[PDB]
Amino acid sequence: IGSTTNLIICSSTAIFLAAGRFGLTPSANRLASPGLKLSPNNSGLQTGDPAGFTATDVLYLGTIGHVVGIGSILGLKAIGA
Amino acid sequence: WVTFYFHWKHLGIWQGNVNQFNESSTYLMGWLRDYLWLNSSQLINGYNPFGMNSLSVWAWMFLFGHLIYATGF
Amino acid sequence: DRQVWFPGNAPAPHLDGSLPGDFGFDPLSLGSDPQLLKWFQQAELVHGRTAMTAVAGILFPAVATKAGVVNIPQWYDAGSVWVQNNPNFPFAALLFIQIILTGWVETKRWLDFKNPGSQADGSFLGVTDDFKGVANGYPGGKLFDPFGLSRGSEGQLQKYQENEIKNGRLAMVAFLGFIAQHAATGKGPIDNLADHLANPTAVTFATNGVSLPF
Amino acid sequence: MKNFTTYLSTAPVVALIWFTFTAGLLIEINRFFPDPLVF
Amino acid sequence: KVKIVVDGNPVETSFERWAKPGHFSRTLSKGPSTTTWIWNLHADAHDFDSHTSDLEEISRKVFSAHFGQLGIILIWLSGMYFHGARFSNYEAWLSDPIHIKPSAQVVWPVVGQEILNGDVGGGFQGVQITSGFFQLWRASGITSELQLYSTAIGGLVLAAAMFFAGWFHYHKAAPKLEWFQNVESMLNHHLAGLLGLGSLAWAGHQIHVSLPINKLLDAGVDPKEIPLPHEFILNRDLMAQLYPSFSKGLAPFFTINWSEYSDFLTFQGGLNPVTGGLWLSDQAHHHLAIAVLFLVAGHQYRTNWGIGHSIKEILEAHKGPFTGEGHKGLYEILTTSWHAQLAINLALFGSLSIIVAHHMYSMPPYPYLATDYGTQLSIFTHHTWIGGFCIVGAGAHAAIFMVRDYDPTNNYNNLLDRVIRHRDAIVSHLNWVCIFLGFHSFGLYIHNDTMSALGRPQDMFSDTAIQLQPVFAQWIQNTHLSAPQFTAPNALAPTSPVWGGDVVAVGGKVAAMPITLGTADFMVHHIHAFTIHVTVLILLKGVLYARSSRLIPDKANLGFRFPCDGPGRGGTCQVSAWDHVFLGLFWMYNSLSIAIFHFSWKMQSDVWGTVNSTGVSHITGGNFSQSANTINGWLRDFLWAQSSQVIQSYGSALSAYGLIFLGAHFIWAFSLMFLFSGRGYWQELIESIVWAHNKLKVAPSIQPRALSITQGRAVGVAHYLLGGIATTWSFFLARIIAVG
Amino acid sequence: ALPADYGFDPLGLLDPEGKGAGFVSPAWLQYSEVIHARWAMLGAAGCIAPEILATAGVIPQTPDEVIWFKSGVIPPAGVYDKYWLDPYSLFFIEVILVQFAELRRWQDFRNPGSQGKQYFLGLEEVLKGSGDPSYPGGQFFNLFNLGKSDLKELKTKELKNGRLAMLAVFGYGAQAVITAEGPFKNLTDHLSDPTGHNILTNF
Numbered sequence A: 001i002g003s004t005t006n007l008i009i010c011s012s013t014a015i016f017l018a019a020g021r022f023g024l025t026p027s028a029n030r031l032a033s034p035g036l037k038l039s040p041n042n043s044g045l046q047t048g049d050p051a052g053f054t055a056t057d058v059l060y061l062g063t064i065g066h067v068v069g070i071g072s073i074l075g076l077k078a079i080g081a
Numbered sequence B: 001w002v003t004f005y006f007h008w009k010h011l012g013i014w015q016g017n018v019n020q021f022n023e024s025s026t027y028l029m030g031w032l033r034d035y036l037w038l039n040s041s042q043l044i045n046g047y048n049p050f051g052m053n054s055l056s057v058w059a060w061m062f063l064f065g066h067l068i069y070a071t072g073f
Numbered sequence C: 001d002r003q004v005w006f007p008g009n010a011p012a013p014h015l016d017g018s019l020p021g022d023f024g025f026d027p028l029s030l031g032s033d034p035q036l037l038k039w040f041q042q043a044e045l046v047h048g049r050t051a052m053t054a055v056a057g058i059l060f061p062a063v064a065t066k067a068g069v070v071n072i073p074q075w076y077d078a079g080s081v082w083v084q085n086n087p088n089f090p091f092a093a094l095l096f097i098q099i100i101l102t103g104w105v106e107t108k109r110w111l112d113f114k115n116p117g118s119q120a121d122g123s124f125l126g127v128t129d130d131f132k133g134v135a136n137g138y139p140g141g142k143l144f145d146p147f148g149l150s151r152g153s154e155g156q157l158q159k160y161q162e163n164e165i166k167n168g169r170l171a172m173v174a175f176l177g178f179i180a181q182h183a184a185t186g187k188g189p190i191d192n193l194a195d196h197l198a199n200p201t202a203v204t205f206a207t208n209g210v211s212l213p214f
Numbered sequence D: 001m002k003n004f005t006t007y008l009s010t011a012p013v014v015a016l017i018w019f020t021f022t023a024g025l026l027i028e029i030n031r032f033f034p035d036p037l038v039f
Numbered sequence E: 001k002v003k004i005v006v007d008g009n010p011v012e013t014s015f016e017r018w019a020k021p022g023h024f025s026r027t028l029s030k031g032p033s034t035t036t037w038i039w040n041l042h043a044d045a046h047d048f049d050s051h052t053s054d055l056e057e058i059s060r061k062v063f064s065a066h067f068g069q070l071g072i073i074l075i076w077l078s079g080m081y082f083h084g085a086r087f088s089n090y091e092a093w094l095s096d097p098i099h100i101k102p103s104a105q106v107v108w109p110v111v112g113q114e115i116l117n118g119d120v121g122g123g124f125q126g127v128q129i130t131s132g133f134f135q136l137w138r139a140s141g142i143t144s145e146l147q148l149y150s151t152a153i154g155g156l157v158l159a160a161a162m163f164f165a166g167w168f169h170y171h172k173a174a175p176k177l178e179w180f181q182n183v184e185s186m187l188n189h190h191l192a193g194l195l196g197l198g199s200l201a202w203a204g205h206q207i208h209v210s211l212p213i214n215k216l217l218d219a220g221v222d223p224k225e226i227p228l229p230h231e232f233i234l235n236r237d238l239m240a241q242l243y244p245s246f247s248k249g250l251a252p253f254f255t256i257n258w259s260e261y262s263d264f265l266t267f268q269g270g271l272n273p274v275t276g277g278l279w280l281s282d283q284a285h286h287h288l289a290i291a292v293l294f295l296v297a298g299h300q301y302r303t304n305w306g307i308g309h310s311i312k313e314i315l316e317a318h319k320g321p322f323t324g325e326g327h328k329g330l331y332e333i334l335t336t337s338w339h340a341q342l343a344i345n346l347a348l349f350g351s352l353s354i355i356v357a358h359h360m361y362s363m364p365p366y367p368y369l370a371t372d373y374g375t376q377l378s379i380f381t382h383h384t385w386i387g388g389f390c391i392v393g394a395g396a397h398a399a400i401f402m403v404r405d406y407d408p409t410n411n412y413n414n415l416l417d418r419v420i421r422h423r424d425a426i427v428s429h430l431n432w433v434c435i436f437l438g439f440h441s442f443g444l445y446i447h448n449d450t451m452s453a454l455g456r457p458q459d460m461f462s463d464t465a466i467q468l469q470p471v472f473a474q475w476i477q478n479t480h481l482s483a484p485q486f487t488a489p490n491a492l493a494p495t496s497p498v499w500g501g502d503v504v505a506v507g508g509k510v511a512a513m514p515i516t517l518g519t520a521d522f523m524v525h526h527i528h529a530f531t532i533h534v535t536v537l538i539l540l541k542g543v544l545y546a547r548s549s550r551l552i553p554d555k556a557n558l559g560f561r562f563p564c565d566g567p568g569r570g571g572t573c574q575v576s577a578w579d580h581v582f583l584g585l586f587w588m589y590n591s592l593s594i595a596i597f598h599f600s601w602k603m604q605s606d607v608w609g610t611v612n613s614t615g616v617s618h619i620t621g622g623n624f625s626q627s628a629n630t631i632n633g634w635l636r637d638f639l640w641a642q643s644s645q646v647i648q649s650y651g652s653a654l655s656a657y658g659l660i661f662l663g664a665h666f667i668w669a670f671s672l673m674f675l676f677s678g679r680g681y682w683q684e685l686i687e688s689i690v691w692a693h694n695k696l697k698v699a700p701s702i703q704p705r706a707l708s709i710t711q712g713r714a715v716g717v718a719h720y721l722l723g724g725i726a727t728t729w730s731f732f733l734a735r736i737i738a739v740g
Numbered sequence F: 001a002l003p004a005d006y007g008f009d010p011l012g013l014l015d016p017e018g019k020g021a022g023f024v025s026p027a028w029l030q031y032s033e034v035i036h037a038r039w040a041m042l043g044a045a046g047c048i049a050p051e052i053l054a055t056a057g058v059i060p061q062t063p064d065e066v067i068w069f070k071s072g073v074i075p076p077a078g079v080y081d082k083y084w085l086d087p088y089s090l091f092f093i094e095v096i097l098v099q100f101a102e103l104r105r106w107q108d109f110r111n112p113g114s115q116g117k118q119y120f121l122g123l124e125e126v127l128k129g130s131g132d133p134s135y136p137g138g139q140f141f142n143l144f145n146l147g148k149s150d151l152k153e154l155k156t157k158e159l160k161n162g163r164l165a166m167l168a169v170f171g172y173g174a175q176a177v178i179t180a181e182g183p184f185k186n187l188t189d190h191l192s193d194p195t196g197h198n199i200l201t202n203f
């Protein structure tokens, strides 16, 4: 707790989740065009959050945050930092 | 079949060993090994990496005939 | 309808309850053809009656041997002991006698199956009515049923047919058990029963050493 | 059972049974009477 | 919406159609009039789209047939494990894998055939096996016949489960057509669930079972004294004795201290010097990385939660100025034509089997595989052949799609339409490439044979004369040798000893060594390029002209499989796409025969052999570089010299190979009667024979016919392939078992 | 309509259309949840009750030997010393008796009411079921006649306790793998020192 690896993992998961919540990523209820333009998608998934943030978005964005954090941690250990 | 028979029986007779035909011709591996394989050794060495001799024309024609036969297929 | 082997499952449709021992059991539908079904009925009867005779001839001598009154060998050794004790009776002569005698009686049974009542013509020593046969697998008459337990009443005959087929199936299963127990213990069946009676929580298939080869 | 026995009477099943019997008979003759060259 | 949809009890389970041969076909169900009906029943049995046009019924048949094939494969695999458990010298071989020859087949003593139970070592007599099961079982950690028995029993249970499922999903709960067309869901599940979780579970087995048991085996512990795998499961201290990072448990995994696990997840490269196989720790790390990559790959496609790709959208987006409408319409083809899917999957599966052959010889993944020369040669040759046959099948089912499932309305100015619209350019350019390759590959050999026969070796294409050095491949070898220095710094060694470096020797025999490439290698590689290009030309020409040509404009109406369109237009025999498959099979045979001959000779001459103090004594003493640049060199020094073992095998345990050598020569020659003749002759001969039977009142009611023209071709090519391949099989196996 | 219906079916497995045949039908899945729930309640009570009673001295067996995974179910993890019968003979008896119970229950599922027709030593009177496979009832299975008016509330309570028991049995298995101690031993280590005994310290 408070360690470096914990900091990278929690921060990466938090920023990816927050970017997904505030419409800065493709999500279950908004999908990207070929020209990378987000348009709403009727997924039919129920969600209590007013921004349309589903549990699917939580799972994928937490996975991507873990992936980015782990790659960053291993690369910084390899680089010497 | 006729000429194979003539040649192998006479090869045994000319080399003074009639037992080779008498014992090996009763089965087909005998024909393959003791007639075709055994007697092709000088022929296919008519030319090799070490040089050539006067049998090289027959080695070349041997392969030539195999090639023409295959092209017919 | 009648009681079935698997309660809640409809009996096999080619089984209608007329045959003795009909609990509707035919999951492979081996008796779909009626003539093949009659053949299999005679097969089951011959197997069951042979099993009952054999199981009696194993159990009663083994019970008497266990008491110590006699020293009859166990069923899996009796042929060897007989041959060692009968050097003037060769195995092949005994086999030839058995084959010709069983051939005579079994060919008569076979020809009655092909042509029911055709052995009733008096060709065998003048026997006519006693070889006519009552039903498929149930010869009857004064020779095979000399006490007349099939000619008394219908319900008595059905009761005895039920008794016969159920005891025959039980004896067939018991002979299978005899084979399996001898292979697993190397002892006779009454020896197995006595060992289980002396110490039942220790003498089980789990402790014979071959049913659980761990 | 009638349909099943009709399938068992189809030509390759009968061929399989008959040739299994014939091959088994030849094999067991040569097992019991090894190396027969002459009568 | 992706969901499970089935129909309940669509087909009754009954033997009624078993009693009616040809029930599946409207033409064949009426029964025979002639003997042609007997052949047509077998030829049409698995042609589901010929039986019906309903795609749902076809798909259900395909699914349940696949279950049947899986059950057959599991019966076969359980048989191999059972024969290892019951009829093998596996435990003796485990105690001494260098001197004992693997054997898992024992013949019964009758008619003198017990001579085939050879003295293979370990106090055992049996047929020597070359499938590599012993090396695979040893790598898995199997130390006893009991574990082989357990796998055999479990395989038969799973085989019964596969046969139950095929009956169940055809007769009880048959999936509807929309279930099968969920290609996005199937790709997600097969990438993440089949391949990804399969690789993860196998990494689990390797780490927890294969690594410690093989570590103890290569340390020299007797296999009967090694603890059983579950002892390594239950006792963490026992595993930490061999891999000290196991004392930390799963905490390094969860705290991203992954470098702690470096004792059992390695990047050594090269081969284990004790066994000659790849490091099992490298394999564990490989399978873990593969598992993660496939688990990520299985999340690409959209199913039910909005995110993910639509494959149709991806395909319709990829079009350009040269290519018209691009990949439009391909999604509809690949979700409605089973044959298009079969063509693609056969092409890639066969190419994979060939790649597997090369990668397993070069980087032998099993302990003591590389010095079991019979096993090495056998598995290379086998997987090469399976690959070639699958590629020819890809050509066949591509052509079948083109005849039966192609619809011009759904392919307007897309890639398929534009490929058809310049098929003449494609075929003419490929024709020129094949002629150029044949001239400048085979004519180099003919030049060399002629120069050598004329006594002019200085005028030859050779390493000591006019040189043709494969400098690009030599540079690739040098790059891969130098890779651990700069471009793969955390790899300790190169991927294979074939690139360069030192000999890997096991038990005084070469496991792997550098494979140098000179003029003979250049020449034979261009032979390979030529033969592959010609096989491609035949199959691709069959696909492109399956529907029409300038000769026959309505060929699609004649079908995929038809003998000809008559003697007119000069003569139109073998215009059908099926006949292109028929010819492509021969050229596949020619190509792959040269490939496996190249393998056998080059390994015997330049890799395999015994190690002494002076160096390496190769099996055929380096004669590849001296004589493989002439046809006469191949005929003498490979075929004539190496056939000595199979033709001298009589009276030994290898005599079965000599007999099969002769019988395969026979079957090959027998095929030429079908290939060279025509059915009109045979039908007239049958007329005379039928007269003789009519005279004696023994004419059959099923009227005898000669085989059809197409069946005559099929019989001819089947016997040609069987005879030639089995000839090479017996030659290879007798040779390498006797001199390996 | 269904008891304990939270609308939680993210894999749409209880969808009725297309899932007619097989075990993915809604009826089989609700029935299977109920069966899993009741078996899990028996297991969740039974996998920790001997350990609790041995720790408290009610039973004389030591708490180490009555831990659920060391009492004979997994002999690599331990065997209880000398039951009245060996575990494999007990398993033979268990196979026979439980097959009787389970096959009769199954025959009620496939053929409702059929287990009240054939003679079963008079027991077929109380084995007719109710037409609802998960809830047979009658004079034995509901012998106290409970749920006269709150049968749906009792079904919800049964399913809630069963789901909790299912999670508890999964926790028993996971904690047995991680710690190699009994579930009550784990609870007492968490109670005695909560910071120094948890999943972060056991890893």
Ligand code: CLA
Pocket: E062, E063, E064, E066, E067, E070, E179, E180, E182, E183, E185, E186, E189, E190, E193, E194
């Ligand atoms: C994670 C899920 C999963 C897994 C592991 C598989 C695996 C497989 N599928 Mg795929 N499938 C899936 C999901 C999955 N499928 C979904 C969601 C769909 C619909 C979109 C399909 C539609 C599909 C079709 C249409 C076909 C396959 C086939 C196959 C087999 C490919 C050949 C092979 O490599 O055999 C390797 C074999 C083994 C490793 C032996 C063990 C295989 C185990 C026992 C099966 C595990 C998968 C199964 C789905 C688990 C469910 C259990 C079941 C009782 C409900 C293989 C068994 C082909 C075929 O072979 O099926 C008969 C085939 O034609 N699948």
Ligand code: CLA
Pocket: B067, B070, B071, B072, B073, E430, E431, E432, E434, E435, E436, E437, E438, E439, E442, E443, E446, E534, E537, E538, E583, E586, E587
């Ligand atoms: C050894 C037997 C043999 C030979 C020589 C050939 C020859 C050829 N095949 Mg044929 N093929 C064969 C067996 C053979 N085939 C069999 C058995 C079948 C039945 C399945 C086929 C079926 C078949 C198909 C289906 C196809 C071919 C094609 C080809 C050509 C490949 C292109 C090429 O290499 O041109 C170069 C020519 C050669 C390599 C032959 C040797 C030429 C020598 C070295 C040159 C000598 C010139 C000479 C000295 C100058 C003249 C002097 C003289 C007049 C005095 C070539 C003409 C393919 C083709 O047509 O595509 C273009 C094609 O599609 N073949």
Ligand SMILES: CC1=C[C@H](O)CC(C)(C)[C@H]1/C=C/C(C)=C/C=C/C(C)=C/C=C/C=C(C)/C=C/C=C(C)/C=C/C1=C(C)C[C@H](O)CC1(C)C
Pocket: F008, F009, F010, F011, F012, F013, F036, F037, F039, F040, F041, F042, F043, F044, F045, F046, F047, F067, F068, F069, F071, F073, F166, F167, F169, F170
């Ligand atoms: C709903 C949802 C929906 C969607 O759609 C999909 C999804 C997501 C999939 C889903 C989810 C889910 C869930 C999670 C499942 C899981 C579960 C559980 C865990 C089970 C169990 C279950 C469990 C149970 C059976 C149990 C039971 C137990 C037993 C009795 C035990 C017994 C014991 C005893 C006492 C004691 C001794 O010494 C031993 C023993 C013998 C051992």
Ligand SMILES: CC1=C(/C=C/C(C)=C/C=C/C(C)=C/C=C/C=C(C)/C=C/C=C(C)/C=C/C2=C(C)CCCC2(C)C)C(C)(C)CCC1
Pocket: A013, A058, A059, A060, A061, A062, A063, A066, A067, A070, E292
């Ligand atoms: C605000 C709010 C809230 C909260 C929320 C939260 C707090 C969230 C969180 C969440 C999170 C925090 C999540 C996360 C997740 C994660 C995940 C999902 C992950 C996963 C991972 C993975 C999957 C991994 C994988 C791997 C491995 C295993 C190894 C190899 C590599 C990799 C990495 C790939 C609530 C609702 C209460 C209320 C309202 C408002």
Ligand SMILES: CC1=C(C/C=C(\C)CCC[C@H](C)CCC[C@H](C)CCCC(C)C)C(=O)c2ccccc2C1=O
Pocket: D015, E673, E674, E675, E677, E678, E679, E682, E683, E705, E706, E707, E708, E709, E711, E712, E713
């Ligand atoms: C030899 C030959 C034949 C004659 C071959 C025939 C008719 C095949 C004969 C196969 C078997 C032997 C016929 C009999 C099959 C019966 C099932 C046999 C039953 C007898 C038992 C002993 C099994 C052709 O018909 C033909 C057609 C087209 C191109 C080339 C050829 C060709 O080369």
